[PDB]
Amino acid sequence: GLEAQKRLRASRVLLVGLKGLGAEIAKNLILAGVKGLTMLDHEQVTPEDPGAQFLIRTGSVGRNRAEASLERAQNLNPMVDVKVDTEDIEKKPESFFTQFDAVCLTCCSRDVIVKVDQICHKNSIKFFTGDVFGYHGYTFANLGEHEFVEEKTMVKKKVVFCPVKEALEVDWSSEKAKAALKRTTSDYFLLQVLLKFRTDKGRDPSSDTYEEDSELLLQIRNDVLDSLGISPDLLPEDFVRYCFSEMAPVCAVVGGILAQEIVKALSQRDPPHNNFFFFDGMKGNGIVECLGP
Fold first, then answer.
1. Which residues are CB-neighbours of 223 under 8 A, at least 6 positions away?
2. Domains plus CATH for the chain?
3. What family does the database annotate?
4. For residues 199, 92, 29 and 273, what is the CA-based torsion angle, rounded to 10 degrees?
5. Cβ–Cβ < 8 Å for 39, 22
């Protein structure tokens, strides 16, 4: 679209977390030509990061992940104002988010995702989150009341979104929810298991301690599925073997989907996925789920 491009080129995006998924998102957004992208990450480069991640030069272990990504990110499009922020996202005051038109979170804890979603909803900022765990990946969008144009021939269409807290808590005890459960990807419950591992451990499952991590994941599988009154065998028993580490192709697929969703929301064209997109790199599937309302 024509005026869609004017919106996109005037848009400023906050991107949190510069592991494998984050640079893929950064690369796509920078190539698309947004006005500015702020890359925020307070963590240091780990030995495992360069395996999926193309913005950081080899041998950067110990460097801050955002600072180590700046040169290659900026080189993608000199017309984009790429900035780095090394401050923990939890330090940020509410006023920090208001300078951005869209916020996208990766590698953030569940509590952080809820808090930032509520800040964005109150200030009408487009909110996204996504992560990759091994062969699996997901994206989430909360665009609030999102207005957009389509074809058929212009069609001004509105789609209502729901907060991430409501999307991450689904009452499966309403009879209506039981029927919808049979057609649920079960990657959604994989997300719940991995998100509480992140909360409990302060980190994601790591292949050097795959040896706890399948261990801890087995408890979360029983802990969350019983908590939600769901059978423990809804998701594969051996799910622990396909949710470890970062694979570059998986980050590419999930980052491409998420970046296109961000572009759709900023340019206000085409129906955005509402509200979850689940990718399984083993079966080659991408599934859109609407959860929360």
1. 196
2. 2-163+247-289 (3.40.50.720), 167-241 (no CATH)
3. Belongs to the ubiquitin-activating E1 family.
4. 50
5. yes
User: What does the DSSP 8-state code read for residue 56?
Assistant: S
Packing angle, helices 65-76 and 20-32, rounded to 10:
30
Unique residue bearing structure tokens 């609030």:
144
| Dist. CA 27–CA 265, nearest whole Å | 17
CA 263 – CA 269 distance, rounded (Å): 9
- d(C-alpha 282, C-alpha 242), whole Å: 8
Query: 3-state DSSP call for residue 148?
Result: strand
DSSP of 174-203, one letter per residue? SHHHHHHHHT--SHHHHHHHHHHHHHHHSS
CA distance 157 to 231: 39
243 φ, ψ to 5°? -125, 25
CA angle 21, 70, 16 (to 5 degrees): 40
Q: What is the DSSP string of 211-278?
A: HHHHHHHHHHHHHHHHHTT--TTSS-GGGGGSS-SB-HHHHHHHHHHHHHHHHHHHHTBSPPP-SEEE
- 219 Cβ contact list (under 8 Å, min separation 6): none
Residues 6+ apart with CB under 8 A from 121: 127, 142, 144, 163
- Reported resolution in A? 2.0
- Side-chain-side CA neighbours of 171 within 13 Å: the count stands at 5
Determined by which method? X-ray
Place of tokens 């969350």: 224
- Tokens 């212009």 label which residue? 154
